[PDB]
Amino acid sequence: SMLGDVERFFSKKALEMRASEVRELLKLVETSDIISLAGGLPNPKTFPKEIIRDILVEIMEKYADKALQYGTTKGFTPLRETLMKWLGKRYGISQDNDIMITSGSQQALDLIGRVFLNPGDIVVVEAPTYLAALQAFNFYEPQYIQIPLDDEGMKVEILEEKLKELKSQGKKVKVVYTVPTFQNPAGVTMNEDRRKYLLELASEYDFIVVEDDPYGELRYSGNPEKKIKALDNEGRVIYLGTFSKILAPGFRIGWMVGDPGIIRKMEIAKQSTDLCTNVFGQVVAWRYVDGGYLEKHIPEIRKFYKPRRDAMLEALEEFMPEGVKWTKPEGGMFIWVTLPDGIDSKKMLERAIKKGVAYVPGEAFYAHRDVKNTMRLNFTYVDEDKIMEGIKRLAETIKEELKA
Amino acid sequence: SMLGDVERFFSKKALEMRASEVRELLKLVETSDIISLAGGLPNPKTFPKEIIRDILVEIMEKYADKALQYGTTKGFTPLRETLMKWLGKRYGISQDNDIMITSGSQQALDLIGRVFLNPGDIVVVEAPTYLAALQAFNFYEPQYIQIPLDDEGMKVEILEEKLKELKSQGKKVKVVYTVPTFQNPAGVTMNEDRRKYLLELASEYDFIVVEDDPYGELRYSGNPEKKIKALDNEGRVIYLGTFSKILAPGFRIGWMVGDPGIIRKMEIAKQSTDLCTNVFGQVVAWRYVDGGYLEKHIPEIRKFYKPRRDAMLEALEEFMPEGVKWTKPEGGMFIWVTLPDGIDSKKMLERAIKKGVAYVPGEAFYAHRDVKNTMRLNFTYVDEDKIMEGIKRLAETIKEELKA
Numbered sequence: 001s002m003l004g005d006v007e008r009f010f011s012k013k014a015l016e017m018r019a020s021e022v023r024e025l026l027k028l029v030e031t032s033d034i035i036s037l038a039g040g041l042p043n044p045k046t047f048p049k050e051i052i053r054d055i056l057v058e059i060m061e062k063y064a065d066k067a068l069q070y071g072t073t074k075g076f077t078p079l080r081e082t083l084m085k086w087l088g089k090r091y092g093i094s095q096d097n098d099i100m101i102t103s104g105s106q107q108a109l110d111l112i113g114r115v116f117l118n119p120g121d122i123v124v125v126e127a128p129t130y131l132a133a134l135q136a137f138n139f140y141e142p143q144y145i146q147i148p149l150d151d152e153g154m155k156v157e158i159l160e161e162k163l164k165e166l167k168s169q170g171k172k173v174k175v176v177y178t179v180p181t182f183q184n185p186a187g188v189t190m191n192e193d194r195r196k197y198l199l200e201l202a203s204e205y206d207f208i209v210v211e212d213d214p215y216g217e218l219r220y221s222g223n224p225e226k227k228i229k230a231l232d233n234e235g236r237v238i239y240l241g242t243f244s245k246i247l248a249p250g251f252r253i254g255w256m257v258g259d260p261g262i263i264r265k266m267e268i269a270k271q272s273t274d275l276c277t278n279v280f281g282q283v284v285a286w287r288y289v290d291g292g293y294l295e296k297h298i299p300e301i302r303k304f305y306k307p308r309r310d311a312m313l314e315a316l317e318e319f320m321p322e323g324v325k326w327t328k329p330e331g332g333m334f335i336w337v338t339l340p341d342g343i344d345s346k347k348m349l350e351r352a353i354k355k356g357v358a359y360v361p362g363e364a365f366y367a368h369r370d371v372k373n374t375m376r377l378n379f380t381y382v383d384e385d386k387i388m389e390g391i392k393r394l395a396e397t398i399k400e401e402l403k404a
Numbered sequence: 405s406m407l408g409d410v411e412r413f414f415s416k417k418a419l420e421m422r423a424s425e426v427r428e429l430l431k432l433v434e435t436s437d438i439i440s441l442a443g444g445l446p447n448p449k450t451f452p453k454e455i456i457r458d459i460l461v462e463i464m465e466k467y468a469d470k471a472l473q474y475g476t477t478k479g480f481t482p483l484r485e486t487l488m489k490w491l492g493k494r495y496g497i498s499q500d501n502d503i504m505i506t507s508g509s510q511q512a513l514d515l516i517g518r519v520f521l522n523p524g525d526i527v528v529v530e531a532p533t534y535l536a537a538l539q540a541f542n543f544y545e546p547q548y549i550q551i552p553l554d555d556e557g558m559k560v561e562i563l564e565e566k567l568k569e570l571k572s573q574g575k576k577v578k579v580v581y582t583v584p585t586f587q588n589p590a591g592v593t594m595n596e597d598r599r600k601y602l603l604e605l606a607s608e609y610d611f612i613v614v615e616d617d618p619y620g621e622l623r624y625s626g627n628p629e630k631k632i633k634a635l636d637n638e639g640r641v642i643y644l645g646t647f648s649k650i651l652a653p654g655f656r657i658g659w660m661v662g663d664p665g666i667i668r669k670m671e672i673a674k675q676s677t678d679l680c681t682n683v684f685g686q687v688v689a690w691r692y693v694d695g696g697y698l699e700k701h702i703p704e705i706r707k708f709y710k711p712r713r714d715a716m717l718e719a720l721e722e723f724m725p726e727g728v729k730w731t732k733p734e735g736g737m738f739i740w741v742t743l744p745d746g747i748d749s750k751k752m753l754e755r756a757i758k759k760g761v762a763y764v765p766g767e768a769f770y771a772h773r774d775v776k777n778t779m780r781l782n783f784t785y786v787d788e789d790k791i792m793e794g795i796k797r798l799a800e801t802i803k804e805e806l807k808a
């Protein structure tokens with residue numbers, strides 16, 4: 001820095017912000033010739049580029065001044081309308097909710113932190129959970145309770161146990177954050193009984209549920225789940241959707257649906273953080289949905305990623321040694337691996353990289369960083385031939401690690 | 405709300421957030437038949453729609469995967485490069501600074517609050533200043549010191565007086581926020597001597613200067629100023645630019661240029677607030693600048709708004725009664741009016757609306773809401789016939805108001 005000790009200017013929160021050594025290393029990996037299973041990106045082969053070109057032409061013909069001008073903080077009205085209609089018809093979400101457009105679900109998470117969290121308020125997350133949600137919420141200094149997953153999602157019985165324990169300490173939870181379908185990073189899905197159990201708990205213990213759902217349309221097998229927000233009779237759930245994996249992440253458009261009183265506060269908070277979400281992308285998204293292109297494209301996304309999920313699940317079954325376990329996702333972008341303990345996967349990444357493969361060590365996905373034998377693998381953005389070879393190199397890395 | 409007292413969930417900052425009665429009244433005015441001088445929008449006639457159409461075609465032919473994919477938090481590299489080149493050549497800004505792309509300068513102002521401000525830290529603003537900057541900063545609970553303007557911008561001598569008084573109280577300012585060229589809302593420009601004086605103060609009293617410059621290219625008369633950032637040999641200035649008034653606001657792209665240590669902290673802060681600025685708009689902005697379209701288009705924006713500024717200034721001279729004063733901007737979007745005091749322009753707005761005209765009462769633009777006889781008028785997005793008529797209606801409103 002030109003100012004020398006620039007830290008003398010920074011706020012208490014800024015002084016706590018740091019770069020992750022692992023995220024930095026992984027950035028270097030992506031641009032080199034290693035086979036990386038560490039990515040979190042959708043494959044550009046799935047971006048509907050013809051449909052996007054046609055929509056861009058249409059916007060410059062018919063909607064140019066709307067797409068190019070400032071928008072309201074709440075969002076482009078026709079997008080908000082088409083979304084609520086889509087969500088009602090497709091998922092059974094109640095039209096009594098209100099909706100705001102966000103600059104990605106990442107912004108929704110930050111706005112949830114702003115609007116709900118005082119320092120020390122208690123947020124429940126899954127263990128593991130989405131690392132960027134911990135990052136959004138951490139600015140607001142919550143205390144976390146983490147609830148393990150199993151192959152059917154959050155262990156909602158352990159949440160009831162922890163809620164009773166907190167109540168006995170005179171404390172309560174303000175928000176439960178869940179990624180209940182094709183989780184990033186675990187890949188598993190909360191079963192229907194647990195969804196309804198979660199909402200009974202939300203009523204009994206008086207908390208809000210944030211349901212973050214980027215992946216529900218990326219379903220490759222099994223039958224559609226019921227959205228937690230579709231089961232929500234009390235208006236306790238805030239549902240987050242995003243265009244990032246169903247259109248393309250480059251437009252940075254998402255939406256937040258929930259109780260009108262909550263949405264009004266969110267609108268005020270957002271006004272000072274970014275004024276409005278880019279209106280040009282909102283118009284593109286509106287045509288994409290209203291023009292029926294979303295509905296027509298979703299099957300092509302599923303057809304693309306399904307064989308990639310399958311190649312990775314086949315390669316794990318064939319190559320992994322005894323005592324390694326992995327989830328079997330019905331959709332989404334990730335498979336989550338557990339190493340016969342106590343291999344530490346963060347320590348093992350060095351070795352894996354040396355053998356020409358990378359993954360994300362699972363420790364960052366735990367609010368308490370207390371589980372060390374997990375890894376997130378991604379199958380969306382590399383290719384079957386490299387999925388097989390990558391998984392073999394990871395399997396030999398684990399066999400080598402299991403010795404002295 | 406369906407949750408009843410939904411306030412029971414809200415954070416302390418959320419509980420303070422309110423909608424503005426004036427802004428809500430003005431949203432209603434905009435849609436109706438009144439002549440509004442209250443707007444803050446550029447005119448869509450200045451959007452370079454043909455150039456935009458050609459760039460969109462180009463992006464889908466050559467840059468589609470980059471425009472559609474997630475980007476880095478820091479921004480799309482070719483845009484960052486082209487902007488630092490433009491800034492160096494056109495304004496003499498030093499290439500030792502770093503740059504980050506923002507989701508609008510609104511997001512820059514929020515990130516400055518995040519990164520610099522603890523509760524009670526002292527921010528200096530002009531009186532008046534940009535109301536959305538007070539909104540971004542308010543979440544972080546600063547104390548403000550306000551420094552009046554005159555027809556040559558901030559009275560930097562009164563700032564030196566206030567810095568000495570604060571020093572005698574054992575206190576310091578952390579940030580000075582200035583909109584030094586064609587201010588929103590006042591229209592005036594800080595002279596060269598004051599820019600240099602401000603920077604000697606920034607050295608002597610050790611504070612950071614934020615230079616928000618949305619308008620420097622919208623110059624209609626006079627000669628170009630030197631950017632404060634161009635005079636900054638110590639790296640104390642963070643310069644904010646935006647594409648809102650020189651391209652179109654619908655892409656929501658801005659940039660922040662300053663010391664690399666500060667920029668690095670900003671990048672970490674931004675990562676959890678929105679992940680990245682929308683990359684599709686970043687690629688549009690990159691072609692717009694790198695392809696030489698910005699340079700070619702800037703004279704057409706100036707040709708467009710100049711006669712509207714001129715019509716407004718002619719109408720005020722012909723119609724306004726004795727004792728009314730207004731600024732004489734060399735550029736930008738606004739003229740700022742002072743009523744022979746006593747008149748409260750917020751009270752008067754009711755009367756003006758009844759006579760068919762609206763403006764923004766000046767009070768919201770003061771950190772201490774302590775000046776009551778000012779108004780912001782806009783000339784960009786009403787038309788010359790309606791500017792003359794609207795100024796006449798406003799003039800008659802003030803004549804009527806002056807009769808006790």
Ligand SMILES: *Cc1c(COP(=O)(O)O)cnc(C)c1O
Nearest residue numbers: 104105106130184214242244254
């Ligand atoms: C993919 C992902 C998102 C996407 O966030 P955006 O800001 O909309 O791109 C959000 N939540 C989770 C859990 C994700 O995996």
Ligand SMILES: *Cc1c(COP(=O)(O)O)cnc(C)c1O
Nearest residue numbers: 508509510534588618646648658
């Ligand atoms: C127009 C204006 C802006 C624009 O902010 P964006 O978020 O980039 O659209 C910023 N600052 C001031 C002083 C303005 O008048």
Ligand SMILES: O=C(O)CCC(=O)C(=O)O
Nearest residue numbers: 039040041132184474679
């Ligand atoms: O840039 C990234 O990896 C974060 C994008 C994202 O949301 C994801 O990885 O799923």
Ligand SMILES: O=C(O)CCC(=O)C(=O)O
Nearest residue numbers: 213214215216217241242
């Ligand atoms: O469609 C999906 O993949 C998730 C459901 C949704 O609305 C979203 O995209 O966020």
Ligand SMILES: O=C(O)CCC(=O)C(=O)O
Nearest residue numbers: 070275443444445588648
């Ligand atoms: O809607 C508005 O007026 C706020 C947007 C803005 O930047 C401005 O007005 O100059």
Ligand SMILES: O=C(O)CCC(=O)C(=O)O
Nearest residue numbers: 617618619620621645646
């Ligand atoms: O272009 C202007 O009008 C101001 C200069 C700038 O870089 C910006 O637009 O913010």
